[PDB]
Coordinates of C-alpha atoms and ligand atoms in Angstrom, one line a residue:
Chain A
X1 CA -57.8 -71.5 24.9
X2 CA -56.5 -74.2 22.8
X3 CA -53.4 -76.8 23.9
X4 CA -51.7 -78.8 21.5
X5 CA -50.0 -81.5 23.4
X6 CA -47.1 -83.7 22.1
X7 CA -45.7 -86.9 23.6
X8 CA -43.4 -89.6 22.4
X9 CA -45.3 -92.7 20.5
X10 CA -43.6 -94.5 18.4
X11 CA -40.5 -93.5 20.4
X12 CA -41.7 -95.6 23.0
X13 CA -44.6 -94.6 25.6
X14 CA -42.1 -95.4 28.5
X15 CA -43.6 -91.6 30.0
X16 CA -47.5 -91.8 29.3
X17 CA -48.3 -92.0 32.7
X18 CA -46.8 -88.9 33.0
X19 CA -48.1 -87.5 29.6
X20 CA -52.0 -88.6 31.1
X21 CA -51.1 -86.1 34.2
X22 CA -49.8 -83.5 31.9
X23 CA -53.3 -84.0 29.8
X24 CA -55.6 -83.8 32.4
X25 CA -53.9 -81.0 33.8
X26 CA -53.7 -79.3 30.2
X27 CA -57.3 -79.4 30.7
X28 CA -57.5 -76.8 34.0
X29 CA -56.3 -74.0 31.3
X30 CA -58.2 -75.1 27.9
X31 CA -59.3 -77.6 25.1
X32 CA -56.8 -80.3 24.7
X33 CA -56.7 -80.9 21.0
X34 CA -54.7 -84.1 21.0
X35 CA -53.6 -93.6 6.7
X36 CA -50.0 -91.6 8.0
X37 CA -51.5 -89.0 5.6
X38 CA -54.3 -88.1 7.2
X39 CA -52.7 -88.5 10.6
X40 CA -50.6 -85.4 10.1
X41 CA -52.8 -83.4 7.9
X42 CA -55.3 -83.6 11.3
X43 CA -52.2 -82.7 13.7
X44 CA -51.0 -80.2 11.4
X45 CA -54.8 -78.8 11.3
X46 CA -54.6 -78.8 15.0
X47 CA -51.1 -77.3 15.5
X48 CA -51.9 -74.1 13.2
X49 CA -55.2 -73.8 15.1
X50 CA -53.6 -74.2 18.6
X51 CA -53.0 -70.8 21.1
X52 CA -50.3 -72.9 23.1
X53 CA -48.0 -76.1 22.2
X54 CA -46.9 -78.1 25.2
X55 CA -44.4 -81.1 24.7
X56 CA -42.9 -83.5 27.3
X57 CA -39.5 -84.1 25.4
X58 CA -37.9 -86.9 28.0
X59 CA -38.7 -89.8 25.5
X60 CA -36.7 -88.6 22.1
X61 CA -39.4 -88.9 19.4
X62 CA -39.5 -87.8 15.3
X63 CA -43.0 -86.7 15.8
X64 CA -42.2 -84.7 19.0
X65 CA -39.7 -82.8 17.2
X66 CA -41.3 -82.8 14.1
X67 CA -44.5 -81.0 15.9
X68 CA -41.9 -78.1 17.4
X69 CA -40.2 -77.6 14.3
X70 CA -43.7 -76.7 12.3
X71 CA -44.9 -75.0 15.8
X72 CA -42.0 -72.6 15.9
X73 CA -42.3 -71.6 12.4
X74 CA -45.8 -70.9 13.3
X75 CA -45.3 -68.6 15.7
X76 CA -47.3 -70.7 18.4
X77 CA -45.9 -70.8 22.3
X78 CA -44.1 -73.7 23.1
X79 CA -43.6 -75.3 26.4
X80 CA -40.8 -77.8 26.6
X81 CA -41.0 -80.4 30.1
X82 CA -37.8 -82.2 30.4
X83 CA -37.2 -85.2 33.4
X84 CA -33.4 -84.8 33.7
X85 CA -34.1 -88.0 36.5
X86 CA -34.3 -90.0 33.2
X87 CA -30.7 -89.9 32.9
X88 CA -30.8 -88.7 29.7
X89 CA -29.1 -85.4 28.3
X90 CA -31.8 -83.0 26.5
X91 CA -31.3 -82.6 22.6
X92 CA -29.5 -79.3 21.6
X93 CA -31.4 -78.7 19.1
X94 CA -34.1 -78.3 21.3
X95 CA -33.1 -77.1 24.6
X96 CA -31.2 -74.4 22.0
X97 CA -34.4 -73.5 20.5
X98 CA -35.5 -71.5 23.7
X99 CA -36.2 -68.2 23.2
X100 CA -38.3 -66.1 25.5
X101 CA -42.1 -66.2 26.1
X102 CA -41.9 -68.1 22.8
X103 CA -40.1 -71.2 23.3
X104 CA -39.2 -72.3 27.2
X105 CA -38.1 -75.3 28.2
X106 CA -38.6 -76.5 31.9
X107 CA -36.4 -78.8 34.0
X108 CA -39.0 -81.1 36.2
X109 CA -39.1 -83.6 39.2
X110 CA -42.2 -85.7 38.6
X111 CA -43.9 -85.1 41.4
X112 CA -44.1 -81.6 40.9
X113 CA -45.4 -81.2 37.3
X114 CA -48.6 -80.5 38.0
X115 CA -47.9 -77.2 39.8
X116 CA -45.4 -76.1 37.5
X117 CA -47.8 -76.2 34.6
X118 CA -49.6 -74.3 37.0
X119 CA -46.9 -71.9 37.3
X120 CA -46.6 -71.8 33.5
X121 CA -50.2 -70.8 32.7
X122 CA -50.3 -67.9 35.6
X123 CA -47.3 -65.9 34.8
X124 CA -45.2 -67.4 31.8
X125 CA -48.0 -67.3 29.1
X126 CA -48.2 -64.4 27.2
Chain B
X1 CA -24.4 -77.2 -3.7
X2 CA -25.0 -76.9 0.0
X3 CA -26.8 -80.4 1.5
X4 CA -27.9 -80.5 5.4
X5 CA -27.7 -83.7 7.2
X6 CA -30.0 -85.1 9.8
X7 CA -29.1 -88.1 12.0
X8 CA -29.5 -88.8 15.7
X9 CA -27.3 -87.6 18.2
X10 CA -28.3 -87.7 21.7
X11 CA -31.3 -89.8 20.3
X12 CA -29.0 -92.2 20.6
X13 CA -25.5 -93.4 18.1
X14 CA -26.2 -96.9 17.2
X15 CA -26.3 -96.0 13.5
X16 CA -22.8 -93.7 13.6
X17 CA -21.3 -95.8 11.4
X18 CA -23.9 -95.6 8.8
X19 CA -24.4 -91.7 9.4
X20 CA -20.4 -91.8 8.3
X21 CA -21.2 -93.9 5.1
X22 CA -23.9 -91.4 4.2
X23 CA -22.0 -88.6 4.7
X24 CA -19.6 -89.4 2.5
X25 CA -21.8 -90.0 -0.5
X26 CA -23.4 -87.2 0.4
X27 CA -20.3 -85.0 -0.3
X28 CA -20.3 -86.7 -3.7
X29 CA -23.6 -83.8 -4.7
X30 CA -22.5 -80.9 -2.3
X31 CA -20.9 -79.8 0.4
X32 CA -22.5 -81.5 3.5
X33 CA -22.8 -78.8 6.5
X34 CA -23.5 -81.2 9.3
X35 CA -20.4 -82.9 9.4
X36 CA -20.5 -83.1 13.2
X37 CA -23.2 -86.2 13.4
X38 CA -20.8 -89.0 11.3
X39 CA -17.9 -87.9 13.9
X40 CA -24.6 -77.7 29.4
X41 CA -25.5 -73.8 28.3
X42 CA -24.1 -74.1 24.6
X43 CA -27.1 -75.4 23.3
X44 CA -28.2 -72.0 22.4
X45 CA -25.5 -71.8 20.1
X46 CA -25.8 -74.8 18.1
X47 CA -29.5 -74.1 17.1
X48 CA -28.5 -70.8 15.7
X49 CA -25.5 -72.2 13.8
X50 CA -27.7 -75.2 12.8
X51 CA -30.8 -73.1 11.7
X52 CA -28.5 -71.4 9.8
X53 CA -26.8 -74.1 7.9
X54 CA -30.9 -75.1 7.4
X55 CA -31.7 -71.5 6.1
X56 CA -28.6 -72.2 3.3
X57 CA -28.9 -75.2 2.4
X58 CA -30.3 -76.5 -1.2
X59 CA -31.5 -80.1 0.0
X60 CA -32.2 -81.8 3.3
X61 CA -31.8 -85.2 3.8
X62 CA -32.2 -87.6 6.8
X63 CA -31.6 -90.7 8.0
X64 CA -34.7 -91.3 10.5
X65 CA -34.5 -95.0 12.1
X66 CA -33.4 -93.7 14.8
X67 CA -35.9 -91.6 16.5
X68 CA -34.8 -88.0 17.6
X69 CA -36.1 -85.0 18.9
X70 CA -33.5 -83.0 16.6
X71 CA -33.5 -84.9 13.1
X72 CA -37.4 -84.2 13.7
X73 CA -37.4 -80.6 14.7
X74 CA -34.9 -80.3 11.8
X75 CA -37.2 -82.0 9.3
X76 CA -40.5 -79.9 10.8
X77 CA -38.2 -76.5 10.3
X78 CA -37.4 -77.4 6.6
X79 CA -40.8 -78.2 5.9
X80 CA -41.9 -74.8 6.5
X81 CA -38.4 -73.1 5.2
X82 CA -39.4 -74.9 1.9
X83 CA -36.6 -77.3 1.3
X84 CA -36.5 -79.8 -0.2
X85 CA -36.1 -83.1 1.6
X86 CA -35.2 -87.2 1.5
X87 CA -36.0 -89.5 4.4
X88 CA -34.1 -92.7 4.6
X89 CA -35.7 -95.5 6.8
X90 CA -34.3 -98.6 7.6
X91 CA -36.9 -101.8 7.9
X92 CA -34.6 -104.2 9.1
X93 CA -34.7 -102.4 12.8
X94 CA -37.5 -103.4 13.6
X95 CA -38.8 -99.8 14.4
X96 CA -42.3 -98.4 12.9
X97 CA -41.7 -94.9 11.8
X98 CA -43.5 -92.2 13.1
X99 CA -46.9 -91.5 11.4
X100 CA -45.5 -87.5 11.0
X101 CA -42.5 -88.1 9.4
X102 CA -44.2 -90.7 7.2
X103 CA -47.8 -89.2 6.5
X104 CA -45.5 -85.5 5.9
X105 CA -44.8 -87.0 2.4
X106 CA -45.4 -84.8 -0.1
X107 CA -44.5 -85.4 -4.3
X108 CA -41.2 -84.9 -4.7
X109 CA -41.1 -82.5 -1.7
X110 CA -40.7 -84.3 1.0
X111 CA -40.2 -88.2 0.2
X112 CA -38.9 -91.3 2.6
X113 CA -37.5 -93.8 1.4
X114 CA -37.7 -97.5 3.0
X115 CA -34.2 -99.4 2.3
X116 CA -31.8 -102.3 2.9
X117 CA -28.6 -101.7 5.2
X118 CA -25.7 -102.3 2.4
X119 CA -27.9 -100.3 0.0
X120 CA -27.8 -96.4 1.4
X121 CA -25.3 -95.6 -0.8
X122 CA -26.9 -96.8 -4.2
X123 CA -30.2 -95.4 -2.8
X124 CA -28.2 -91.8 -2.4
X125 CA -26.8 -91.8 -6.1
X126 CA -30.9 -92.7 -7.1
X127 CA -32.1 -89.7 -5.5
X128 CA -29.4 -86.9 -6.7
X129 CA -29.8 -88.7 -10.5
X130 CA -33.4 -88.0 -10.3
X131 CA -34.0 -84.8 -8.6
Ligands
6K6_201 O1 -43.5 -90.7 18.4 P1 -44.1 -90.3 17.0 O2 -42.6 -90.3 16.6 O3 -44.7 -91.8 17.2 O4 -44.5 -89.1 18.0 C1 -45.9 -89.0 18.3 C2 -46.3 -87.5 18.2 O5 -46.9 -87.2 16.9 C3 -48.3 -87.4 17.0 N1 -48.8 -88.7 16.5 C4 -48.0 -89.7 16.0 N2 -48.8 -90.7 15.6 C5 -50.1 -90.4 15.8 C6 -51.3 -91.0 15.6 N3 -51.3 -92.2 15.1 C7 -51.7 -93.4 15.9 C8 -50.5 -94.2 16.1 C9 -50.4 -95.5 16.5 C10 -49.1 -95.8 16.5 C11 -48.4 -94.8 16.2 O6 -49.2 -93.7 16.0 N4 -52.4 -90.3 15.9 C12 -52.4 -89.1 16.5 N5 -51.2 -88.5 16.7 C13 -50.1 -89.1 16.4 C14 -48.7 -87.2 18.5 O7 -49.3 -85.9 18.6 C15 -47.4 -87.3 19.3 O8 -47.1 -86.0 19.9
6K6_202 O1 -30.9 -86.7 18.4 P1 -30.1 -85.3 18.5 O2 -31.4 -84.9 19.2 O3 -29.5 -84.7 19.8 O4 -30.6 -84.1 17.4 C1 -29.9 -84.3 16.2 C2 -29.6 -83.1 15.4 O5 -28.9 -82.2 16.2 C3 -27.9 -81.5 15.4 N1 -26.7 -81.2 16.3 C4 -26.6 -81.4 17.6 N2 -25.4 -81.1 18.0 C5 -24.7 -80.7 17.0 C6 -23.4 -80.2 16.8 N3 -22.6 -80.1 17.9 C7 -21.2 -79.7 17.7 C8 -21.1 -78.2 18.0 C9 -20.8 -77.6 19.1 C10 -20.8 -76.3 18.9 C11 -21.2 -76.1 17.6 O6 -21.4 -77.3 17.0 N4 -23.0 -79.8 15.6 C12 -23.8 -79.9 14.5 N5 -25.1 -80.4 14.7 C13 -25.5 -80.7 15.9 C14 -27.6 -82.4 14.2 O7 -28.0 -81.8 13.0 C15 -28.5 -83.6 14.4 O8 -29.2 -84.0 13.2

């Protein structure tokens, strides 16, 4: 299995702590695959290649959404982890785009993200 | 001529004003179908109405200095529905743009454009002339 992972950047890296947990976690169920040119012609390479997208959506971020919006049209799995602790109030545009197995997003405490990626990969992966 | 808007909403509002200003010579080259950035369970309803103002329209354009989970999701959907598309990025800010939205340019496909505040309406009338 492949796992494309997004996380805010240039949004601010306010969350990579957490984004380092979801990584090596990512890494319990497969290969984590993750000049502006050639930075998204190799993400966009990735993305098309990937069995699962993952995105921790918290931090709001162009790329983040930019990496669903071509990940959707794709047809690739998309998981969605949102810290509603943050304070912050989850774009519609996302949160709206859940759909099924296709497109969920999760609701998380911090301390308990580990074992729902757990949960994810057991029984809401198709 | 149908034109969809992007511009951050829960992203944050600091640039509302400007989003109104843009909107407004926007309308100038077709009817603009996102009025609702200028001005809980329901979520689900807006990206279906939203996808489908995308699906119709003839030319996307967004304002992206403010980064946003949706102006970005609506720019990755229009890549792959085809459109059309203007980026307007603001310098000034302070902010460096994200490497996807600025390495995605492609001819006159997909373009982003850097510009002054006190400028976004000249810069609008440049684009529609041209393309
Ligand atoms: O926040 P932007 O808006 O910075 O979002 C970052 C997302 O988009 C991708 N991305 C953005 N920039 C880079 C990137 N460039 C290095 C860099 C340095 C500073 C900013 O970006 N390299 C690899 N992936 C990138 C990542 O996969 C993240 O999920
Ligand atoms: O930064 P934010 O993430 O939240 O994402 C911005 C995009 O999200 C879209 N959007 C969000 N809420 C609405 C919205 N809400 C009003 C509404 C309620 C019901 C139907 O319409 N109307 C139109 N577009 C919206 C806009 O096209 C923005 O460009």
């Amino acid at each position: 299995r492949s796992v494309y992972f997004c996380g805010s950047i240039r949004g601010g890296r306010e969350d990579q702590a957490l984004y380092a947990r979801i990584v090596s976690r990512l890494r319990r169920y497969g290969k984590v695959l993750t000049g502006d040119q050639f930075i998204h012609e190799q993400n966009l390479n990735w993305l098309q290649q990937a069995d699962v997208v993952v995105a921790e959506v918290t931090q709001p971020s162009l790329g983040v959404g930019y990496e669903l919006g071509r990940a959707v049209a794709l047809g690739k799995p998309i998981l969605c982890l949102f810290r509603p602790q943050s304070g912050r109030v989850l774009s519609a545009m996302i949160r709206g785009a859940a759909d099924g197995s296709r497109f969920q997003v999760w609701d998380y405490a911090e301390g308990e993200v580990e074992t729902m990626l757990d949960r994810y990969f057991e029984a809401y992966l198709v």
